[PDB]
């Protein structure tokens, strides 16, 4: 170990064999305002977009 | 398979002797051997390490002179080397399978080019160079590598002054020194030990 | 492995300063002015390989014009015969015949007064 991952990025992006999975934003502290359809479709664990993979796995030290 | 001076064959393996020559592999094992015998003992001084040059040589403006920050800048003739050396190592990693496969590719070409000469046993009695010159001349033989199963003491004391021969054991044989000498003498005990290691 | 570069730099200055031989002043004797002067002389030498083919093409035409008006015909009337007749003879040797073999150039300008087009 002579290369330090961001500890703050490993909290966000867990790595699977399908990619780097993350949770969604807009799911905190203002939730009666939005509809139930917009709280339902952000509740899972999505995947990381192709333009985002290179910036994240330089932070998570994998490039 | 292999033939000897003393009227016999050995029936060595097709594995260790008589395989196919890979020059990309033998080049890598020779560059690896020739670099691990390099000692990286040199150093030059950086601009921090050259003696002096603490203060600025003049004020930043007004003097009509180019910007300087120390007498010991790498542009200045007193200054440090810009990428000054430190003692580093030139050792590199061969795989253990990759050294062995490169030796196994060299021995195959020593057979194929008639540069390998097998004798039944090779022992001198006296610790004397003249006694070993006189025995290599019975084989029509100079600039030789002698590879025995274990180097005995008289065979080492002879031929360690002699100008163009070496006496190695099988463990101590190496890719460069059996591609450098114009002949290699292995005994029949050596081709057994070469097949314990490589086959 | 340190390498000193005084033998390669002096042979590289001496090539560029041999190509500068014959130039006025510091253009032939100091390197910073001779390097620029040899570069410029080979830009001009490139350019004027094209203009040489133009400057002779003008000089041929001007002598053919001058040697045709001796025989009562302009340049452009002499050349005009030959989309109708066909001598297929060029400006380079018609200028050489207008000067030297003046009677064989009179025989060509009467074949062009025979075309009438």
């Amino acid at each position: 170990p002579k290369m330090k991952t961001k500890s703050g990025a490993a909290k966000r992006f867990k790595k699977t064999a399908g990619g780097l999975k993350h949770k969604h934003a807009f799911k905190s502290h203002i939730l009666t305002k939005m509809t139930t359809k917009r709280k339902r479709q952000l509740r899972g664990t999505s995947m990381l977009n192709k333009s985002d993979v290179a910036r994240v796995e330089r932070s998570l030290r994998l490039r | 398979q292999l033939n000897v001076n003393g009227a016999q064959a050995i029936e060595v393996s097709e594995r260790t002797f008589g395989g196919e020559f890979n020059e990309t592999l033998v080049h890598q094992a020779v560059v690896a051997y020739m670099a691990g015998g390099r000692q990286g003992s040199k150093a030059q001084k950086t601009r921090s390490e050259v003696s002096g040059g603490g203060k600025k040589p003049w004020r930043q403006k007004g003097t009509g002179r180019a910007r300087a920050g120390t007498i010991r800048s790498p542009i200045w003739r007193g200054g440090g080397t810009t990428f000054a050396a430190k003692p580093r190592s030139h050792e590199q990693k061969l795989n253990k399978k990759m050294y062995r496969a490169a030796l196994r590719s060299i021995l195959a070409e020593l057979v194929r080019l008639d540069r390998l000469v097998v004798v039944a046993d090779f022992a001198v009695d006296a610790p004397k160079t003249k006694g070993l010159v006189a025995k290599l001349d019975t084989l029509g033989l100079k600039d030789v590598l002698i590879v025995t199963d274990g180097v005995d003491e008289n065979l080492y004391l002879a031929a360690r002054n002699l100008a163009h021969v070496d006496v190695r054991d099988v463990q101590g044989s190496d890719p460069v020194s059996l591609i450098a000498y114009d002949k290699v003498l292995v005994t029949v005990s050596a081709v057994k030990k070469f097949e314990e290691l490589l086959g | 492995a340190r390498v000193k570069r005084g033998v390669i730099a002096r042979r590289r200055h001496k090539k560029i300063l041999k190509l500068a031989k014959g130039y006025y002043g510091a253009r032939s004797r100091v390197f910073r002015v001779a390097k620029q002067a040899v570069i410029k002389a080979g830009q001009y030498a490139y350019r004027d390989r094209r203009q040489r083919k133009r400057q002779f093409r003008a000089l041929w035409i001007a002598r053919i014009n001058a040697g045709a008006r001796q025989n009562g015909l302009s340049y452009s009337r002499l050349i005009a015969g030959l989309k109708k007749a066909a001598i297929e003879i060029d400006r380079k040797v018609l200028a050489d015949l207008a000067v030297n073999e003046k009677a064989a150039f009179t025989a060509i300008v009467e074949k062009a007064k025979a075309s009438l087009a």
Binding site: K23, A25, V56, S59 | - | -
Partner: protein, 144 residues
């Protein structure tokens, strides 16, 4: 073979083009860096994650999960490599004698990912449902 006659295959070694050696080398004057701005300066590096100043992904998406400390000593074997033990007993220690399982592992569950082959006895080792069937098919047995 001579030391004077060895070279590697074409494409094995490359020239290592050096930047900034004249304007014919292709990396003349600037060495692939272009013009002004930080990327051509020395130490001219943009930090990983930095997006010009907006909220980057590692601070804009929520943190989630905990890491289980219960699974640090957990490991999985599969039925392809159960025959690599010796002595017709697959124990926790015997899976460590062959290098199938690290030390500090003390909880092994074996899944089905191939063929068993030999009749092995799995003591003190959990198996899945499709792996217990493929071991008892090949004469295996289970106890603890």
């Amino acid at each position: 073979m001579q030391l004077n006659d060895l070279r590697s295959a074409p494409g094995a070694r490359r020239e290592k083009h050096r930047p900034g050696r004249g304007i014919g080398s292709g990396l003349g004057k600037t060495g692939g860096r272009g013009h002004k701005g930080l990327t051509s300066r020395s130490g001219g590096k943009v930090a990983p994650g930095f997006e010009g100043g907006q909220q980057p992904l590692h601070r804009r998406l929520p943190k989630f999960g905990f890491v289980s400390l219960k699974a640090m000593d957990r490991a999985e074997v599969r039925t392809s490599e159960l025959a690599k033990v010796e002595g017709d007993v697959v124990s926790l220690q015997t899976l460590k004698d062959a290098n199938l399982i690290n030390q500090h592992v003390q909880r092994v569950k074996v899944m089905l990912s191939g063929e068993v082959g030999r009749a092995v006895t799995l003591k003190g080792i959990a198996a899945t449902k499709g792996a217990r069937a493929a071991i008892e098919a090949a004469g295996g047995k289970f106890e603890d």
